[PDB]
Structure 1
Amino acid sequence: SIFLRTKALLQKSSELGALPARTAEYEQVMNFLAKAISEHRSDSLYITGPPGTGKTAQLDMIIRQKFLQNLSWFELPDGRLESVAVTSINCISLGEPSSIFQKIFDSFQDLNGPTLQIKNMQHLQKFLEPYTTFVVVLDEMDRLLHANTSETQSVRTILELFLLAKLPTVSFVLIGMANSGLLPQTIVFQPYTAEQMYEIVIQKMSSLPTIIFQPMAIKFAAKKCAGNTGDLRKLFDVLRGSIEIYELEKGKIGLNYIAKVFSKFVNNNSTRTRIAKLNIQQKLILCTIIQSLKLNSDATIDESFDHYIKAITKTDTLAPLQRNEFLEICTILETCGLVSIKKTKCKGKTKRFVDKIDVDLDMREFYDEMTKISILKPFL
C-alpha cells in the first residue's frame, strides 16, 4: 500500500554521495578528506549545528557510499585508490569517556590477532605508527567533557584526542559532530529553510510512484517547520501524523490535514476557556489564591486558606469552607489547569517541606473574566 510505504519513508529512522540540501557541506567534508588522506596528514574536523540539520545522516551517507577490520578503498580525484579504515563511534553509548581509545582499537584490530589493552592515547599513538589512513567519526563528542570536576579535567579527553589527530607520522583523522594553530576546522550545519525541506521531501518521495500529498500542503508544513531552529524531524512527525489522521478519519491529502495535525498535537488551551468552565465558588477561591500570592508570594496552602477565610468574613459571600474542602477545590483547579500545588522547602528559621501554590495563568484575561462577575470584585 502507498500509505504504509509513505509512512515508512517518513519515519525518523528512515534512510535515503550528497544530501539534497547539503551539497556545500558535502563538498567541504570531501575537500577536508582529500587534504587529509591525499597528503597523508592527520587533521581534525568539528561539525556543529542544532538538532535535525543532518550531520549524522551526511556522515553515514559519506561512509556508506564512498568507502584489520573495516578496511576499504578511498578514491581521489587523481584516482590512486588509497587504503583506509573507517569507523563511527557514538560517544554517549560508551560507559566512560576513558575507554574510547580501546574501542578505536576494538574497531580496528582483528579478532584473530593479539588484543592489547589500550589505556590512553599514548598506546593508540604507538599502535598507529606502522600504518592506510584511520578515519574515526565521533558523534556527540560534546559528551566527551565530564559533568563533574572543573575546566582542567573536563577537557582531558578531547585535548588528548586533538593531539593524537595532529602529531606527525600518523594517519589518524578526527571528525567530531556536536550539538549547539592546532584548532580543528569548523563546519556549521545550518537549520533548513522551507524550500530545502520541500526539496528533501520530494527527493525522498521520488522513489514512490504516486505522491499522496498535494505540493501546497508540503509547502505549508515546511514553512511552519522553518522557524528559528526548525528541524527535519518535526517535519517528518507532522507529515506522518497527517497520514495518521487521514486514515483514522476514513486521494491526495489536503492542506487542512496539516492544520489538523497542528491543532491536535498543540493543546491550545486558553485561560478564557478554563475560567469559563468553573463555577462561582471555584472562581472565588482562584481569586483569593491570586490575592494571597500577590501579597505573600511564598505562601502555603494553609496561609492561602487563612487569607480566604479573612476575605470571606470581610465580604460575607455565601458560606465559608473547611480547610479540606478548600484543598479539594485547589486540586479541582489543578485538574482544570489553572493552579499547581508543589512541595518545597521553606526559607525561614524552621525550614521544612510544605505544600506551595504556583499559578501558570496570565493576569490580563484572568482579570477580564473576573470583572464581568459583580459578586467577585471585592476579591480582585
Structure 2
Amino acid sequence: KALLQKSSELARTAEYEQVMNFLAKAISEHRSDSLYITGPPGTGKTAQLDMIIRQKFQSLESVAVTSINCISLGEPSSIFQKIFDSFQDLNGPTLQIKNMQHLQKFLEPYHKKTTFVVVLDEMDRLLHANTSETQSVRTILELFLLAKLPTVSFVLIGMANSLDMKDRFLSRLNLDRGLLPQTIVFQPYTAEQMYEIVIQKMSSLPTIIFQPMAIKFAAKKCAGNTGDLRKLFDVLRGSIEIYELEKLNYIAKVFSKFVNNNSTRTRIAKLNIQQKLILCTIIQSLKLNSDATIDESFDHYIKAITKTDTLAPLQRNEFLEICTILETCGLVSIKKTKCKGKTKRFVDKIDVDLDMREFYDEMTKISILKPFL
C-alpha cells in the first residue's frame, strides 16, 4: 500500500476554456485581451495563472513569452530587467526599465516580429506595496496605461488577491482605459471543478483509496471553511499513513482533533487541573468585562480560591506562567493594550474564546472544580 500512498501525492482545468476566450488574441498575434484576474485566497489563483502560462508555453513560429514574479521589489525598475531576462543579453537597463516612456522604447521586438506579451505574477505585492497614493498607486498608473502606438504592446496579464485594488484605482482612468475591465473572478470551487481535477490526476487510482462518497463528504465539510482540497488530500494521505502506523474512519476523528480543541482537545490544552482552575477563574472575571489584566484576574483568583478551598493559590509569577501556557495553545488570547494613565501604558487585556456551555461538559465531568463551576 505504501508505494501507492507515497506516490498518491506526487487542457486540464475547465477554467482553461474561459481564459482561452480571453486569449484568442495571443494565438493569432493580435493585441492580447485586457486581463486583470482577481481571486480569493486559497483558490490557487497564483497557481491558476501558472497552469495558464505553463500550458500556453508547452503548447506552442518562434515561441517566446514570460511571466515574472513581483515580490521583493517595492519599485518599478528592477521588474522590467526581469523581462529583459528573456533576451539572455546585457544592456544598460536602469532607465529603459524605469519610466513608462523608456519602457515603450524598451519593447520593440528584435528577432522575427513574433509578438511578446508581458505577464506580472503576484502583483498583489506591488499592489500591496508602499503607500498607495505615493508609489503603489503611482506604479499601477504607470505600468497599467497601455497608450503605445504599435498595437503590439505589453498587454498586462495581472493578478490581485483582494478586490480593493480595483477600488483603489483612479476612477476616471479605470472605466475608459486599461487592462481592468476583464476583472475575472474565480470563486471557491466546493467540489465541482477542483474535485474533478483531483479525480483526473488520480486516474491511476489506488485500489482501496476509500469510499468516494466519504471523500466528497470530506470535500464539503472542509470547503465550508477551506480552499485547499490538495492539502485536504494531504491530510488524507497522513490519515492513511496513520492506518499504516497502527499496522475514511479516522478522518472525522482528525477533523474533531485539529480544528477545535474545544471539542475534546481542550482537556489536553488544560491538562493540569490548575490550568482548568485558572481558566474558570478568567471566566469568572469575565463577569467584570474590564481590562482582564494579570492583576485583575489574579486578585479574582486569590479571592475565589480563598473562598473555594480547593488549593492554596499560586504565586504571581506562577499565574503568569499558567496564562502564558494557556496562550501557547491559544485557547485564550492576550494583547498588551494601551491605557492612558501615566504614559502609553501596555497591560494584558485578554479575551477568552470558550463558552460556559463548552465549560458545561468539560467541568461537569470534573466534580472537583465544580465547587467553582
Deviation, structure 1 residue 298: 0.9
Q: 1:265 to 1:340 in 2, by over 3 A?
A: closer
Per-residue displacement from partner, 1:151-206 (whole Å, max 9, x unpaired)?
35322222222224765443422212229976342222232232433321221122
Distance 1:233 1:192 in 2: 12
Per-residue displacement from partner, 1:342-374 (whole Å, max 9, x unpaired)?
544433234434455443321334367768999
Describe the SS at the equivalent of 1:84: coil
1:280 matched residue in structure 2: 273
Distance 1:313 1:87 in 2: 71
* Pair 1:81-2:75 in alignment: no
Deviation, structure 1 residue 241: 1.9
Distance 2:181 2:211 in 1: 44
Deviation, structure 1 residue 282: 6.2
Kept in 2, the 8 Å contact 1:272–1:369? The answer is no
Distance 1:120 1:287 in 2: 62
Where in structure 2 are there 5+ consecutive unaligned residues?
A: 161-175
Deviation, structure 1 residue 258: 3.2
Kept in 1, the 8 Å contact 2:4–2:206? The answer is no
Q: 1:212 to 1:305 in 2, by over 3 A?
A: closer
Q: 1:272 to 1:364 in 2, by over 3 A?
A: farther
Q: 1:112 to 1:94 in 2, by over 3 A?
A: closer
Q: 1:276 to 1:299 in 2, by over 3 A?
A: closer
Per-residue displacement from partner, 1:181-235 (whole Å, max 9, x unpaired)?
7634222223223243332122112246756444334333333343265333333
- TM-score norm. by structure 1 comes to 0.69
Larger radius of gyration, structure 1 or 2?
1
Q: Which moved more, 1:314-323 or 1:236-245?
A: 314-323
2:205 matched residue in structure 1: 208
Per-residue displacement from partner, 1:103-152 (whole Å, max 9, x unpaired)?
11222353599998522232221122356211222121122225432335
1:22 matched residue in structure 2: 12
2:48 matched residue in structure 1: 58
Q: 1:8 to 1:304 in 2, by over 3 A?
A: same
Deviation, structure 1 residue 64: 4.0
Per-residue displacement from partner, 1:30-74 (whole Å, max 9, x unpaired)?
2322234536325421122223434444544444444xxxxxxxx
Distance 1:202 1:279 in 2: 46
Q: Which moved more, 1:273-282 or 1:36-45?
A: 273-282
2:4 matched residue in structure 1: 10
* Pair 1:223-2:220 in alignment: yes
Identity of aligned residues (%): 99
Q: 1:30 to 1:300 in 2, by over 3 A?
A: closer
Describe the SS at the equivalent of 1:357: strand
Q: How many residues align?
A: 351
Distance 1:103 1:12 in 2: 37
Distance 1:228 1:209 in 2: 28
Aligned-residue Cα RMSD (Å) equals: 5.0
Distance 1:102 1:222 in 2: 43
Q: 1:158 to 1:236 in 2, by over 3 A?
A: farther
Distance 1:247 1:367 in 2: 37
Kept in 1, the 8 Å contact 2:333–2:351? The answer is yes
Whose strand fraction is larger, Structure 1's or Structure 2's? 1
2:303 matched residue in structure 1: 310
Q: 1:110 to 1:308 in 2, by over 3 A?
A: closer
Distance 1:243 1:317 in 2: 45
Where in structure 1 are there 5+ consecutive unaligned residues?
A: 1-6, 16-20, 67-79, 250-254
Distance 2:325 2:220 in 1: 39
Kept in 2, the 8 Å contact 1:165–1:172? The answer is no
Deviation, structure 1 residue 269: 3.2
Distance 1:206 1:296 in 2: 57
Distance 1:317 1:208 in 2: 58
Distance 1:337 1:31 in 2: 47
Kept in 2, the 8 Å contact 1:339–1:357? The answer is yes
Q: 1:322 to 1:378 in 2, by over 3 A?
A: same
Deviation, structure 1 residue 275: 10
Q: 1:345 to 1:318 in 2, by over 3 A?
A: same
Q: 1:185 to 1:377 in 2, by over 3 A?
A: closer
